[PDB]
Structure formats: C-alpha cells, structure tokens
Amino acid sequence: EVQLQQSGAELVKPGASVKLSCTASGFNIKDTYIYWVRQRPEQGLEWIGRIDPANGNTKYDPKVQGKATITADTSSNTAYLQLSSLTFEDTAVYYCALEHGYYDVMDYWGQGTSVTVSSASTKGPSVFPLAPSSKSTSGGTAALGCLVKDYFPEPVTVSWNSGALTSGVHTFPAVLQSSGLYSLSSVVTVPSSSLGTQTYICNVNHKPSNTKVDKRVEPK
Amino acid sequence: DIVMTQSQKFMSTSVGDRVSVTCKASQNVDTNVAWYQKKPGQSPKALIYSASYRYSGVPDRFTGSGSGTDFTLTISNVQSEDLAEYFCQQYNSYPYTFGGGTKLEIKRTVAAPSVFIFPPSDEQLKSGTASVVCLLNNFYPREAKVQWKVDNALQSGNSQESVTEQDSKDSTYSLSSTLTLSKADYEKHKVYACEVTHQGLSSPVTKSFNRGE
C-alpha cells in the first residue's frame, strides 16, 4: 500500500547543515499535501510548514523562518527538509504524513527521523545478557532479557528473534547514567519448560553507530 | 498568532467510564479542528477531522465538539484499553497551530509484581564493571519503593530505576532498578538482595541470590 518511509536518525555538530528525506512509496499522486512536524522529547509539537507538489507556496512558519526550508523531488517524489544553523533547540523527532482530504479519506505517518545536535561523537552500546536464574522462575514460569549500556545517540531499536517476538515484551525508556550515557533493558517472560534449547536473541540495532548485534541469551 | 490550550496537564479515568477532554483557543473556527493520538513511543494518529470522523477510528467511542473559543472531546470507554496522549490542531489557517495536549491515566485494580533478579553477565566482568538489575514485570500502581542490601549492608545512590509506559492490554506497570559498582566492590561480597515495599503489598518482600551457587 503506502509506506512513506523516512531515513534513519542522524547526529551532527552545532553549526551544521542537514537535508532530511521522506519517501512516497504509494503516494505517487500530486494532490497530496505533506507537512513538516517537530516533537521535542519534552512533549512539545509544532507545525513547521507544508508543500504542494503543484506550487507549494508554503515553506516556512512564524518563529521558524530562516531555520528550515522544504523542497521536493521529481524522481521518487521525496520531499526534502533542509535544516541549517542547527542548535540544541532543534533536537526533536520529525515526521511526514500525506492526507488529501478532498480526494482520499485516509493518511499515513512516516517512521520518524530523530536528530541529535550535540558536541559528542557516536558510540555503539554494550549488550550484556540477563541469564534466567533458579530464582527467576515464579510458578513454573521464568523471565529473561538483556541490557544495553552506553549509547550516545538515543535511537536504539531492540528486536527479538528477528522481529518475530512481541509477547510479554517490556522495552524500558533510556535512563541516563552519571557517565552521561544511556542504558536500557529489554526483558520478556517465558515458560521454564523452554529450557530445552529454546533459543532467544536480542536483535538490537544501533543505526547511527552502524552497530548491529543480535546477542543470544542462555542460563548461566 | 493563533494559540490554543488543553487546560489540563494530565488526566486519569476509570476503566469503563467516559471522559471529556477540553481544548480552547483565542480565535473562532468550525468544521476545521482535527485531533491526533501519539501512541506510546509510536507515531501520532489521525484521530479526527473537523470534529467529525476519522479513517479506521472507533465506531464512536470518542466524540467531541465545540467551535469558537471553546471545544471538547468526550470518550466513552466501551471497548477502550487505549492509553496515549491527544492533541488539537488549528488546521483552519496558518500557522495550523496545535495545543498542549493531555495524558491519559487509566485507573485499574492494584496488582502485585512478579520479581526476578539477574546477575551481571560473565562478559561484563571483563570490564571491571558489575550491573545488577532487579526487575518488576507487571504491577499497579506507580508509587512504590526499592531497597538494596548486600550481606546486610544497605546501598544508597548507587542504584537507578527505569519506569516504562503503561501496557495496552493489562494496565500493569514495569520498572527496572539498576545497581552498579566496580567488580572490586562486587566480588567483595556474597549475598545480594533488593527489598521491595509496594503499596499493594503487606510486608516488604526481599528477594536475593548467592554468588557462585
């Protein structure tokens, strides 16, 4: 159907230039009106602007004029979001959506592209497993997981058994350490009878640092 | 410059009752305001248009109106496990301004957690660090208290907790308390525990494990 996929997260230094991309997939039509949206982690959203494939007179928004500029593509119909003079206030999650209310009756939102404007460098996390002990069983049923420590860019995607597991999943928010780094744990509950070589893996992925490790978990 | 508000920072309702969310502004417009839901960690969703309908929405479990300097949105929990945050937009004209939005706190019964403790990975010892995690799978409510003990010795400050969002199905909570020190401090002792005094518990339940089996 439609996908409207955007690129992965990025990290630059204060005083850089960035041009974001959000693909069209199923929206090859020219009647769609895609808008730009910011979302800071402090629960605050804003309307950056919009664009019309046919004469997109929109390109700015008061209090933002000069900080960004949208443009479009004719090869794959991918709207580009140029952002320069970046500061830490620009740090937010951004989106794209196609809703033509006078032609269609549905829309779709992009996966999201996260930006980090800080002076620190990229850093792949550390993946230490969580073996199920004899005390990790509560009523013939145990639990397990893994821990990801020390990743500077916030976007870390913990998959399990290659996007095939979802039952009882609890992925924790990124708590910061005194080291100035993030850490989280991805746990899951399982039956104690699965000790007969039922294998599970933390298919974690760190797109910024190009850090992709799928670590297995084993008791003791 | 058009502004708007929710006049409510956080909201808490029961499992089945209805709840009416307000959204106000400084101008006046009709059949133009839409609403959205930012699902927990998931993208915002097209919740309404013009205060009318929305694709693949609820039958009518949520409903609201109000034009001019007043508006609302009432949601009857008929088959509603949904817990997220919701926002109003002034899509009638530029800057298509938004609003403060309000969180939704589904109330439910008290639930006791299931507790499991995990030792640091043998791999983590190769770095001189030791991260001990006490886990709480499913429980309610939010307010609680954790205490760390090592061969009777209490611990302070050396622990950090991570609080999840609320689960879609069960309204149970999940927290991860993380105790971390050097492997030197670690190997210096044998018995490690986390004491847990939950509001939905009679006496603090202290779970432990001995090193080296």
Coordinates of C-alpha atoms in Angstrom, one line a residue:
Chain A
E1 CA 0.0 0.0 0.0
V2 CA 1.5 3.3 1.2
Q3 CA 4.7 3.4 3.3
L4 CA 6.0 7.0 3.4
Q5 CA 9.3 5.8 4.8
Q6 CA 12.0 8.3 6.1
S7 CA 15.7 7.8 6.5
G8 CA 17.4 6.9 9.8
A9 CA 18.4 9.1 12.7
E10 CA 21.5 11.4 12.4
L11 CA 24.0 13.2 14.6
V12 CA 25.9 16.3 13.7
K13 CA 27.8 19.1 15.4
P14 CA 26.3 22.5 16.4
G15 CA 26.5 24.6 13.3
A16 CA 25.9 22.0 10.5
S17 CA 23.6 21.6 7.6
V18 CA 21.1 18.7 7.2
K19 CA 18.6 17.8 4.5
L20 CA 16.1 15.1 5.5
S21 CA 14.2 12.7 3.2
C22 CA 10.8 11.0 3.4
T23 CA 9.9 8.7 0.5
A24 CA 6.5 8.5 -1.2
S25 CA 6.0 4.7 -1.8
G26 CA 2.3 4.5 -2.6
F27 CA 1.7 8.3 -2.8
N28 CA 2.9 8.9 -6.4
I29 CA -0.1 11.3 -6.8
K30 CA 0.4 15.0 -6.9
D31 CA -2.7 16.0 -4.9
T32 CA -1.2 15.2 -1.5
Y33 CA -0.2 18.0 0.9
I34 CA 2.7 16.8 3.2
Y35 CA 3.5 18.9 6.2
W36 CA 6.6 19.1 8.5
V37 CA 6.3 18.5 12.2
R38 CA 8.8 18.6 15.2
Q39 CA 8.5 16.8 18.5
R40 CA 10.9 17.6 21.3
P41 CA 11.3 14.9 24.0
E42 CA 9.7 17.4 26.4
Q43 CA 6.3 16.6 24.8
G44 CA 6.0 19.6 22.5
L45 CA 4.9 19.5 18.9
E46 CA 4.8 22.3 16.2
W47 CA 3.8 22.9 12.6
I48 CA 6.9 23.6 10.6
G49 CA 5.2 24.0 7.3
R50 CA 3.8 22.2 4.2
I51 CA 4.3 21.8 0.5
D52 CA 2.2 21.3 -2.6
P53 CA 3.6 19.2 -5.4
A54 CA 1.9 21.7 -7.7
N55 CA 3.0 25.1 -6.5
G56 CA 4.0 24.6 -2.9
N57 CA 3.6 28.2 -1.7
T58 CA 4.3 27.0 1.9
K59 CA 7.9 26.9 3.0
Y60 CA 8.0 28.5 6.5
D61 CA 6.2 29.1 9.8
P62 CA 6.5 32.2 12.0
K63 CA 9.1 31.9 14.8
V64 CA 10.9 29.4 12.5
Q65 CA 11.5 31.5 9.3
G66 CA 15.2 31.1 8.3
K67 CA 15.8 27.9 10.2
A68 CA 14.4 25.4 7.7
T69 CA 13.3 25.1 4.1
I70 CA 11.4 22.3 2.4
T71 CA 11.8 21.1 -1.2
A72 CA 10.6 18.2 -3.3
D73 CA 12.0 15.6 -5.7
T74 CA 10.8 14.5 -9.1
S75 CA 12.5 11.1 -9.4
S76 CA 10.8 9.3 -6.5
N77 CA 8.6 12.1 -5.1
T78 CA 10.6 12.5 -1.9
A79 CA 10.1 15.8 0.0
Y80 CA 13.4 17.1 1.3
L81 CA 13.7 19.0 4.6
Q82 CA 16.8 21.3 4.7
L83 CA 17.8 22.3 8.2
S84 CA 20.9 24.5 8.8
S85 CA 22.3 26.6 11.7
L86 CA 21.3 23.8 13.9
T87 CA 21.2 24.2 17.7
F88 CA 20.1 22.0 20.6
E89 CA 16.6 23.5 20.4
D90 CA 16.3 21.8 17.0
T91 CA 16.7 18.4 18.8
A92 CA 13.3 16.7 18.2
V93 CA 11.6 13.9 16.4
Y94 CA 10.2 14.8 13.0
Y95 CA 7.5 13.2 10.8
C96 CA 5.8 13.3 7.4
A97 CA 2.2 12.5 6.5
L98 CA 0.1 12.5 3.3
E99 CA -3.6 13.3 3.7
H100 CA -5.6 14.7 0.8
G101 CA -9.0 15.2 2.4
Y102 CA -10.7 16.3 -0.9
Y103 CA -9.6 13.1 -2.7
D104 CA -8.8 10.4 -0.1
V105 CA -10.2 9.5 3.3
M106 CA -7.1 8.1 5.0
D107 CA -3.5 9.0 5.6
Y108 CA -0.2 7.5 7.0
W109 CA 2.7 8.7 9.1
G110 CA 6.4 8.3 8.5
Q111 CA 8.5 6.1 10.7
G112 CA 10.2 9.2 12.1
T113 CA 13.7 10.6 11.9
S114 CA 15.4 11.6 15.1
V115 CA 18.1 14.4 15.2
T116 CA 20.8 14.9 17.9
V117 CA 22.6 18.2 18.0
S118 CA 25.4 17.7 20.5
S119 CA 29.2 18.0 20.5
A120 CA 29.8 14.4 21.4
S121 CA 30.7 11.6 19.0
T122 CA 28.8 8.4 18.1
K123 CA 29.1 5.4 20.4
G124 CA 27.9 1.9 19.9
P125 CA 26.2 0.4 23.0
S126 CA 27.2 -2.5 25.2
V127 CA 25.0 -5.6 25.2
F128 CA 25.2 -7.7 28.4
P129 CA 22.6 -10.6 28.6
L130 CA 20.4 -11.4 31.6
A131 CA 20.5 -15.2 32.3
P132 CA 17.5 -16.7 33.9
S133 CA 18.4 -17.9 37.4
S134 CA 16.7 -20.5 39.5
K135 CA 15.1 -17.6 41.3
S136 CA 14.0 -16.0 38.0
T137 CA 11.2 -18.6 37.9
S138 CA 7.9 -17.7 39.6
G139 CA 5.4 -20.5 39.4
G140 CA 6.9 -22.8 36.8
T141 CA 7.4 -19.7 34.6
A142 CA 10.6 -17.7 34.3
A143 CA 11.8 -14.5 32.6
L144 CA 14.9 -13.2 30.8
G145 CA 16.2 -10.3 28.8
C146 CA 19.3 -8.2 28.1
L147 CA 20.8 -4.8 28.9
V148 CA 22.1 -2.2 26.5
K149 CA 24.6 0.2 28.1
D150 CA 26.4 3.3 26.9
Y151 CA 25.0 4.5 23.6
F152 CA 25.2 8.3 22.9
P153 CA 22.5 8.6 20.1
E154 CA 19.1 7.9 21.7
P155 CA 17.6 5.8 18.9
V156 CA 18.3 2.2 19.7
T157 CA 16.0 -0.5 18.3
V158 CA 15.9 -3.7 20.3
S159 CA 14.4 -6.6 18.2
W160 CA 13.9 -10.1 19.5
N161 CA 14.3 -13.3 17.4
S162 CA 14.5 -11.0 14.3
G163 CA 11.2 -9.2 14.7
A164 CA 9.2 -12.3 15.5
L165 CA 8.7 -12.0 19.2
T166 CA 6.3 -9.5 20.9
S167 CA 4.6 -11.4 23.8
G168 CA 5.3 -10.1 27.2
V169 CA 7.8 -7.6 25.9
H170 CA 8.8 -4.6 28.0
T171 CA 11.3 -2.2 26.5
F172 CA 12.4 0.4 29.0
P173 CA 13.0 4.1 28.4
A174 CA 16.5 5.3 28.0
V175 CA 17.7 6.3 31.6
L176 CA 20.8 8.4 31.6
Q177 CA 23.8 7.4 33.8
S178 CA 26.2 9.6 35.7
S179 CA 28.5 8.8 32.8
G180 CA 26.3 11.0 30.7
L181 CA 25.3 7.9 28.7
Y182 CA 22.0 6.0 28.2
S183 CA 21.1 2.5 29.3
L184 CA 18.0 0.4 28.9
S185 CA 16.8 -3.2 29.4
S186 CA 14.7 -5.3 27.1
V187 CA 13.0 -8.2 29.0
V188 CA 10.5 -10.9 28.2
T189 CA 8.7 -13.6 30.2
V190 CA 8.9 -17.3 29.1
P191 CA 7.9 -20.7 30.4
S192 CA 10.5 -22.6 32.4
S193 CA 9.9 -25.6 30.2
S194 CA 11.6 -23.7 27.3
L195 CA 14.9 -24.6 29.0
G196 CA 15.1 -27.5 26.5
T197 CA 17.2 -25.5 24.0
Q198 CA 14.6 -22.9 23.1
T199 CA 16.9 -20.1 21.9
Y200 CA 16.1 -16.4 22.1
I201 CA 18.1 -13.4 20.8
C202 CA 18.2 -9.7 21.4
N203 CA 18.3 -8.5 17.8
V204 CA 19.3 -5.0 18.9
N205 CA 20.2 -2.4 16.3
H206 CA 22.0 0.9 16.6
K207 CA 21.6 2.6 13.2
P208 CA 23.7 5.7 13.9
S209 CA 26.9 4.0 15.0
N210 CA 26.2 1.2 12.5
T211 CA 26.1 -1.1 15.5
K212 CA 24.1 -4.3 14.8
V213 CA 24.5 -7.2 17.2
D214 CA 21.9 -10.0 17.7
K215 CA 23.0 -11.4 21.1
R216 CA 21.7 -14.7 22.3
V217 CA 20.6 -15.3 25.9
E218 CA 21.5 -18.5 27.8
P219 CA 21.0 -19.5 31.5
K220 CA 24.3 -19.3 33.4
Chain B
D1 CA -0.8 34.4 16.1
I2 CA -3.5 31.8 17.0
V3 CA -3.0 29.9 20.2
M4 CA -4.8 27.1 21.9
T5 CA -4.8 25.1 25.2
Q6 CA -6.0 21.9 26.8
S7 CA -6.4 23.5 30.2
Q8 CA -5.5 20.0 31.6
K9 CA -1.9 18.8 32.0
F10 CA -2.8 15.2 33.0
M11 CA -6.0 13.1 33.0
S12 CA -7.0 10.0 34.9
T13 CA -10.2 8.0 34.3
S14 CA -11.5 4.6 35.2
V15 CA -11.6 1.5 33.0
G16 CA -15.1 2.0 31.6
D17 CA -16.4 5.5 32.4
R18 CA -16.4 8.3 29.8
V19 CA -14.0 11.2 29.9
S20 CA -14.5 14.7 28.3
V21 CA -11.3 16.4 27.1
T22 CA -11.4 20.2 26.6
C23 CA -9.4 22.3 24.1
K24 CA -9.7 26.1 23.9
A25 CA -8.2 28.8 21.8
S26 CA -8.1 32.6 21.2
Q27 CA -10.0 32.8 17.8
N28 CA -13.0 31.1 16.3
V29 CA -13.3 28.3 13.7
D30 CA -15.7 25.4 12.9
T31 CA -15.6 22.2 11.0
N32 CA -11.8 22.6 10.7
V33 CA -10.2 21.3 14.0
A34 CA -8.7 17.9 13.9
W35 CA -7.2 15.7 16.7
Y36 CA -4.5 13.2 17.0
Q37 CA -3.2 10.4 19.3
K38 CA 0.5 9.9 19.9
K39 CA 0.6 6.3 20.8
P40 CA 3.2 5.5 23.4
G41 CA 6.5 5.5 21.5
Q42 CA 4.5 5.3 18.3
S43 CA 3.7 8.0 15.7
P44 CA 0.7 10.3 16.0
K45 CA -2.5 9.0 14.5
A46 CA -5.3 10.8 12.6
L47 CA -7.9 10.8 15.3
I48 CA -10.5 13.1 13.8
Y49 CA -11.2 15.8 11.2
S50 CA -13.4 18.9 11.5
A51 CA -14.6 17.3 14.8
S52 CA -16.4 14.7 12.6
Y53 CA -14.9 11.2 11.8
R54 CA -11.5 9.6 11.0
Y55 CA -10.4 6.6 9.0
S56 CA -10.4 3.2 10.8
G57 CA -11.3 5.1 14.0
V58 CA -13.6 3.8 16.8
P59 CA -17.3 3.4 16.0
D60 CA -18.0 6.4 18.2
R61 CA -16.3 5.5 21.5
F62 CA -14.8 9.0 21.3
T63 CA -16.7 12.1 20.4
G64 CA -16.3 15.9 20.8
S65 CA -17.3 19.2 19.5
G66 CA -17.1 23.0 20.2
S67 CA -16.3 25.9 17.8
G68 CA -15.2 29.4 18.6
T69 CA -13.5 30.0 21.9
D70 CA -14.5 26.6 23.2
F71 CA -14.3 22.9 22.3
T72 CA -14.3 19.4 23.9
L73 CA -13.8 15.7 23.2
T74 CA -15.6 13.0 25.2
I75 CA -14.5 9.4 25.1
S76 CA -16.7 6.6 26.4
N77 CA -14.6 3.5 27.3
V78 CA -16.8 0.9 25.7
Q79 CA -14.0 -1.3 24.5
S80 CA -11.2 1.1 25.3
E81 CA -7.8 -0.3 26.5
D82 CA -6.2 2.8 24.8
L83 CA -3.7 4.8 26.8
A84 CA -1.9 7.6 25.0
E85 CA -1.8 11.4 24.6
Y86 CA -4.1 13.5 22.4
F87 CA -3.7 16.9 20.8
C88 CA -5.9 19.5 19.0
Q89 CA -4.8 21.5 15.9
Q90 CA -5.9 24.8 14.5
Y91 CA -5.8 23.5 10.9
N92 CA -8.2 26.3 9.8
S93 CA -5.4 28.6 8.8
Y94 CA -1.7 29.2 9.3
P95 CA 0.3 28.5 11.4
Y96 CA -2.1 25.5 11.7
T97 CA -1.3 25.8 15.4
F98 CA -1.5 22.9 17.9
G99 CA -2.1 22.6 21.6
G100 CA -0.7 21.5 24.9
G101 CA -2.3 18.0 24.8
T102 CA -3.2 15.9 27.8
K103 CA -2.0 12.5 29.1
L104 CA -4.4 9.7 29.9
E105 CA -4.1 7.7 33.2
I106 CA -6.2 4.6 33.1
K107 CA -7.1 3.5 36.6
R108 CA -7.2 -0.1 37.5
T109 CA -7.0 -2.6 40.4
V110 CA -3.9 -2.9 42.5
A111 CA -1.6 -5.5 41.0
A112 CA 1.3 -7.1 42.7
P113 CA 4.6 -7.6 40.7
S114 CA 6.4 -10.8 39.9
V115 CA 10.1 -10.4 40.9
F116 CA 13.2 -11.9 39.3
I117 CA 16.8 -10.9 39.9
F118 CA 19.7 -11.2 37.4
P119 CA 23.4 -11.3 38.0
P120 CA 25.8 -9.4 35.7
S121 CA 26.8 -11.2 32.6
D122 CA 30.1 -13.1 32.9
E123 CA 31.0 -11.0 29.9
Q124 CA 30.5 -7.8 31.9
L125 CA 33.3 -8.9 34.4
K126 CA 35.9 -8.4 31.6
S127 CA 35.4 -4.6 32.1
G128 CA 35.6 -4.4 35.9
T129 CA 32.0 -3.3 36.0
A130 CA 29.1 -5.1 37.6
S131 CA 25.5 -4.1 36.8
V132 CA 22.9 -5.9 39.0
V133 CA 19.2 -5.5 37.9
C134 CA 16.1 -6.0 40.0
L135 CA 13.1 -6.4 37.7
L136 CA 9.3 -5.8 38.2
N137 CA 7.2 -7.4 35.5
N138 CA 3.6 -6.5 36.0
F139 CA 2.1 -4.4 38.8
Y140 CA 0.0 -1.3 39.8
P141 CA 0.0 1.4 40.9
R142 CA 3.1 3.6 40.1
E143 CA 4.2 4.8 43.6
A144 CA 6.5 2.3 45.3
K145 CA 9.9 1.9 46.9
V146 CA 13.0 -0.3 46.4
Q147 CA 15.9 -1.0 48.8
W148 CA 19.2 -2.7 48.0
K149 CA 21.0 -5.0 50.5
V150 CA 24.4 -6.8 50.2
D151 CA 25.3 -9.1 53.0
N152 CA 23.1 -7.0 55.3
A153 CA 24.9 -3.8 54.0
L154 CA 22.4 -1.2 52.7
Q155 CA 23.0 0.7 49.5
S156 CA 22.2 4.3 48.5
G157 CA 22.6 6.4 45.4
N158 CA 24.4 3.5 43.6
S159 CA 21.1 2.4 42.0
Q160 CA 19.0 3.8 39.2
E161 CA 15.4 2.9 38.1
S162 CA 13.8 3.0 34.7
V163 CA 10.0 3.4 34.5
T164 CA 8.1 2.1 31.5
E165 CA 4.9 3.4 29.9
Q166 CA 1.6 1.6 30.5
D167 CA 0.8 -1.6 28.8
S168 CA -2.0 -1.7 26.2
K169 CA -3.8 -4.8 27.5
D170 CA -3.3 -5.1 31.2
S171 CA -2.7 -1.7 32.8
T172 CA 0.2 -3.2 34.8
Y173 CA 3.5 -1.3 35.3
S174 CA 7.1 -2.4 34.8
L175 CA 10.2 -0.9 36.4
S176 CA 13.9 -1.9 36.3
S177 CA 16.1 -1.0 39.3
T178 CA 19.8 -1.0 38.3
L179 CA 22.5 -1.4 40.9
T180 CA 26.0 -0.9 39.6
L181 CA 29.5 -0.7 41.1
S182 CA 33.0 -1.9 40.3
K183 CA 33.7 -5.6 40.1
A184 CA 36.0 -5.0 43.1
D185 CA 33.1 -3.8 45.2
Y186 CA 31.2 -6.6 43.6
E187 CA 33.5 -9.6 44.2
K188 CA 34.0 -8.4 47.8
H189 CA 30.6 -9.9 48.9
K190 CA 28.5 -13.0 48.5
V191 CA 24.8 -12.2 49.2
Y192 CA 22.9 -9.6 47.2
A193 CA 19.2 -8.6 47.5
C194 CA 16.6 -6.0 46.7
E195 CA 14.0 -5.2 49.2
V196 CA 10.6 -4.1 47.8
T197 CA 7.9 -2.2 49.7
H198 CA 5.0 -1.9 47.3
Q199 CA 1.8 -0.1 48.1
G200 CA 0.0 -3.2 47.0
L201 CA 2.0 -5.4 49.4
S202 CA 1.7 -6.2 53.1
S203 CA 5.3 -6.5 54.1
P204 CA 8.4 -5.7 52.0
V205 CA 9.4 -8.8 50.1
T206 CA 13.2 -9.2 49.8
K207 CA 14.5 -11.4 47.0
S208 CA 18.1 -12.4 46.9
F209 CA 20.7 -14.8 45.3
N210 CA 24.1 -16.1 46.4
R211 CA 27.2 -15.9 44.1
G212 CA 29.0 -18.9 42.9
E213 CA 26.0 -21.2 43.6

